[PDB]
Amino acid sequence: SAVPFHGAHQAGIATPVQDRLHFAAFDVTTEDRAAFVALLKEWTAAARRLTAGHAVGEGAYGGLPEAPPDDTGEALGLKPSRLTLTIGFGPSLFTRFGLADLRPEALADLPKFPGDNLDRARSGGDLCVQACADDPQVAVHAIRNLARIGFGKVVVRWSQLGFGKTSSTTPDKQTPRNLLGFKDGTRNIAGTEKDRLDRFVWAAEKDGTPWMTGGSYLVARRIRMHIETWDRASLQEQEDVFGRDKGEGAPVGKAKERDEPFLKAMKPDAHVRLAHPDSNGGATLLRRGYSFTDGTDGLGRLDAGLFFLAYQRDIRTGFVPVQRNLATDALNEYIQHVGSAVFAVPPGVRDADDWWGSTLF
């Protein structure tokens, strides 16, 4: 029902995946370091209440009738719904407040990749809040109120709602399906593998940027799916594209979805074969992404796809090589990357006196 906000790490990374996502990048409008630190503290105070299901500040009502409510109200009477709020700091943030020399090496800018069609308006950002919850309105309310609290000091650059499973109907003993119709998540790092998070996800002190020990690095890609094209392809084309069958999700020739894959049995350009760590010198990702359907465009097509999110200990040893190994992926015929951003995710709020980003400021 509620995920502990405080911790060595921020919640929302290795904690159970919630049903809905509301992702927002902000740009910073102030040049004042003090102003900004002030805001980070206020934001942390508000996260504490939100994640515990209380209104922000003095509340949503019952105040001076001649002042606007501290909290906008639309969450009154809902449960915290496993709300987690994770903040990240984008590369452009380190050009302000004189932090240029504190940018971590691992927060590397992404190359341009074959096929990229990055929309600048839906790319980048000085910082980000990932808001995950089982109730979409709880998620929206958090983002809405944080934007409200930071107004005049930050603005929302771009926004993405996503959804995964519906927990009030689907078993946790069950893998969700992406909008292409294949199980998605079968081979991933799971929050239970302290060993794999420590090795593959968390930033380590001896990695090079001490303020980031306990943090992680986030890569975000808005990936539109060409659905009407995909739906016209034969069942065998689709299975051929991934290296797994559609119904059970098993690696070709195997019979259970969770049978270890035999990579030589898959077509050389199969998605699973190209993404697999054995084809990538061990590179392994924690994927934590959501499907989106934003509507339909001016030509009658479903504007839908996968808001892809990956956490890793180092962007250079995680996303960049795997993404690069996808240059010839058969999936490329059916997807286009149209947004992208990277963020360093600072370590957690240790206690009630800690604040977001304290290790950096």
Q: Which two tokens stand for residue 319?
A: 């996303």
- In the complex with a second copy, the residue whose CB is nearer, 293 or 358, is 293
Q: With respect to a second copy, which residue has the nearer C-beta, 108 or 302?
A: 302
Of 153 and 287, the one with the shorter C-beta distance to a second copy is: 153
Ligand-binding annotation for 287, yes or no, is: yes
CA atoms within 13 A on the CB side of 92: 15
Task: Among 35, 45, 99, 304, indicate the residue that binds a second copy (CB under 8 A).
Answer: 304
* 275 interface partner picked from a second copy, ligand HEM, none, CB below 5 to 8 A per type: ligand HEM
Interface with a second copy (CB under 8 A), residue from 10, 18, 81, 209: 81
Sign (positive/negative) of CA torsion 245, 249, 252, 256? negative
Is 271 annotated in some ligand binding site?
A: yes
**Residues binding ligand HEM (CB under 6 A):** 178, 180, 182-188, 221, 223, 225, 242, 244, 261, 271-272, 275-277, 285, 306, 308, 319, 322-323, 326, 335
Q: Which residues pair with 302 in a beta bridge?
A: 296
Q: Which stretch binds a second copy (CB under 8 A): 7-15, 124-132, 175-183, 213-221?
A: 175-183
CB closer to ligand HEM out of 217 and 319 = 319
The answer to the question of residue 140 lying near a second copy (CB under 8 A) is yes
Q: Quick check: 119 and 160 in contact, CB under 8 A?
A: no
With CB under 5 to 8 Å by kind, the binding choice for 319 among ligand HEM, a second copy, none is ligand HEM
295 burial class (0-12, 13-18, 19+ CB within 10 angstroms)?
exposed
Is position 307 annotated in a ligand binding site? no
| 267 CB neighbour count, 10 Å cutoff | 14
Instruction: Please name every residue paired with 311 in a beta bridge, in sequence order, or none if there are none.
Output: 218, 286
Task: Write a three-state SS string for 111-135.
Answer: CCCCCCCCCHHHCCCCEEEEEEECC
Binding status of residue 63 toward a second copy by CB under 8 A: yes
**Measured between alpha carbons, how far is 122 from 127 in angstroms, rounded to an integer?**
13
- Contacting a second copy (CB under 8 A), which of 161, 250, 266, 283? 161
Q: Where are the alpha helices (DSSP H) in the chain?
A: 33-51, 136-150, 194-200, 227-232, 235-242, 271-275, 319-324
- Residue 192 touches a second copy, criterion: CB under 8 A: no
Among residues 109, 169, 281, 353, the one that binds a second copy under rule CB under 8 A? 169
Q: How far is CA 171 from the centre of its chain?
A: 22
Which partner in ligand HEM, a second copy, none is near 293 (CB below 5 to 8 A by kind)? a second copy
Q: Between the CA of residue 146 and those of 135, 153, 271, what are the distances in Å?
A: 17, 11, 38
337 marked ligand binding residue = no
Minimum CB distance to ligand HEM, residue 262 (Å): 11
Q: Is 295 in the site for a second copy (CB under 8 A)?
A: yes
Residue pair 308/185 in contact (Cβ under 8 Å)? The answer is no
Helix (H, G, I), strand (E, B) or coil at 240: helix
Query: Cβ closer to a second copy: 99 or 147?
Result: 147
The binder of 323, among ligand HEM, a second copy, none, by C-beta within 5 to 8 A per type, is ligand HEM
The annotated binding site is made up of 185-187, 271, 287, 308
